[PDB]
Design an enzyme around this catalytic site. Structure first.
Site, mmCIF file in Angstrom:
data_model
loop_
_atom_site.group_PDB
_atom_site.id
_atom_site.type_symbol
_atom_site.label_atom_id
_atom_site.label_comp_id
_atom_site.label_asym_id
_atom_site.label_seq_id
_atom_site.Cartn_x
_atom_site.Cartn_y
_atom_site.Cartn_z
ATOM 1 C CG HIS A 253 -0.644 -0.431 2.481
ATOM 2 N ND1 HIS A 253 -0.326 0.445 3.519
ATOM 3 C CD2 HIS A 253 -0.526 -1.677 2.997
ATOM 4 C CE1 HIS A 253 -0.017 -0.253 4.590
ATOM 5 N NE2 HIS A 253 -0.108 -1.523 4.300
ATOM 6 C CG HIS B 3 3.653 5.678 5.530
ATOM 7 N ND1 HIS B 3 3.632 5.506 6.894
ATOM 8 C CD2 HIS B 3 2.464 6.209 5.188
ATOM 9 C CE1 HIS B 3 2.459 5.913 7.356
ATOM 10 N NE2 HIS B 3 1.745 6.369 6.341
ATOM 11 C CG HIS C 158 -0.790 8.404 2.390
ATOM 12 N ND1 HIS C 158 -1.444 7.191 2.473
ATOM 13 C CD2 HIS C 158 -0.223 8.597 3.611
ATOM 14 C CE1 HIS C 158 -1.304 6.711 3.700
ATOM 15 N NE2 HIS C 158 -0.577 7.545 4.405
ATOM 16 C CD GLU D 62 -3.888 9.194 3.886
ATOM 17 O OE1 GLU D 62 -3.381 9.201 5.032
ATOM 18 O OE2 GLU D 62 -4.389 8.184 3.344
ATOM 19 C CG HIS E 58 1.209 10.089 7.289
ATOM 20 N ND1 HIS E 58 0.125 9.361 6.800
ATOM 21 C CD2 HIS E 58 0.846 11.399 7.198
ATOM 22 C CE1 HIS E 58 -0.843 10.192 6.476
ATOM 23 N NE2 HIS E 58 -0.431 11.430 6.697
ATOM 24 C CB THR F 265 -5.096 7.460 7.070
ATOM 25 O OG1 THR F 265 -3.824 7.114 6.531
ATOM 26 C CG2 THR F 265 -4.989 8.694 7.919
ATOM 27 C CB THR F 266 -3.894 2.093 6.280
ATOM 28 O OG1 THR F 266 -2.946 2.140 7.360
ATOM 29 C CG2 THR F 266 -3.342 2.884 5.148
HETATM 30 ZN ZN LIG Z 1 -0.038 7.349 6.394
#
Ligand SMILES: [Zn+2]
Length: 257
Positions: free
Chosen positions: A61, A91, A93, A103, A116, A195-196
């Site tokens: 992801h 990581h 996004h 996000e 993040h 958020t995952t």
């Molecule tokens: Zn994240």
């Protein structure tokens, strides 16, 4: 089998993870005019001088840059936080296009990507225990816009060819996360969630006001990653972001006027 596709993306997550419709989900839109300045919020203390990066992993992801979190080597304290939070991984996004990818949003504006930096509260002993607590994690969120290159990102970009597909890892020692921070540590903060999936409501979010700039070439390298494993059909790892969730009974606080 959650992901970011039409058939398994954010709008489906609630079936496996009912907390997706919870009271403190992330990300959110940050309405700058309605955030309240909280003069008692303390400056953040970001102490990354002794950080030990270990490895970079494509987990299907995102990619995680992982750190040694068995001692207080890279820690976040201050701000809204009580106690000491250890860096475990960072990581990003990102989008398929420069006009989306973040996000969190700011007055509904989407950035090209969002970093993040994930930290856990040392009073809980390990990350797995921390995610079960309402004050278990502190995530430092930093927006990315496309413009000038970020020199401190380049080492990350250059290893991505070695972790193209899900489950691939590479050694990634001596990376200094201080090279990913903007000049200012002015921030917004609110209580939220991962958020995952599993979307646990364990995060004190600290979202910096000042974005960092990365080059078009740098973000393009993000978009060459694959969601899939080697020898599986190629699907580009892009648009790995969850959209803004309802604020519900929360007030976003600002560290700055
Ligand atoms: Zn994240």
């Amino acid at each position: 089998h959650w992901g970011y596709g039409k058939h398994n993306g954010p709008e489906h997550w609630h079936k496996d993870f009912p907390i997706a419709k919870g009271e403190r989900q992330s990300p959110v839109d940050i309405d700058t005019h309605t955030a309240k300045y909280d003069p008692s919020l303390k400056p953040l203390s970001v102490s990354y001088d002794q950080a030990t990066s270990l490895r970079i992993l494509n987990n299907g992801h995102a990619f995680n840059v992982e750190f040694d979190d068995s001692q207080d080597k890279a820690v976040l304290k201050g701000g809204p936080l009580d106690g000491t939070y250890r860096l475990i991984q960072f990581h990003f996004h990102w989008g398929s296009l420069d006009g989306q990818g973040s996000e969190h949003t700011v007055d509904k504006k989407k950035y090209a990507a969002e970093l993040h930096l994930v930290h856990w509260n040392t009073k809980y002993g390990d990350f797995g225990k921390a995610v079960q607590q309402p004050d278990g994690l502190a995530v430092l969120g930093i927006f990315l816009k496309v413009g000038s290159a970020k020199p401190g990102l380049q080492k990350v970009v250059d290893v991505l060819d070695s972790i193209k597909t899900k489950g691939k890892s590479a050694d990634f020692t001596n990376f200094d996360p201080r090279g990913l921070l903007p000049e200012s540590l002015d921030y917004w903060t609110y209580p939220g969630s991962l958020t995952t999936p599993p979307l646990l409501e364990c995060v004190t979010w600290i979202v910096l006001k000042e974005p960092i700039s990365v080059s078009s070439e740098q973000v393009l390298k993000f978009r060459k990653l694959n969601f899939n494993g080697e020898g599986e059909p190629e699907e580009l790892m892009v648009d790995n972001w969850r959209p803004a969730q309802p604020l519900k009974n929360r007030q976003i606080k600002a560290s700055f006027k």
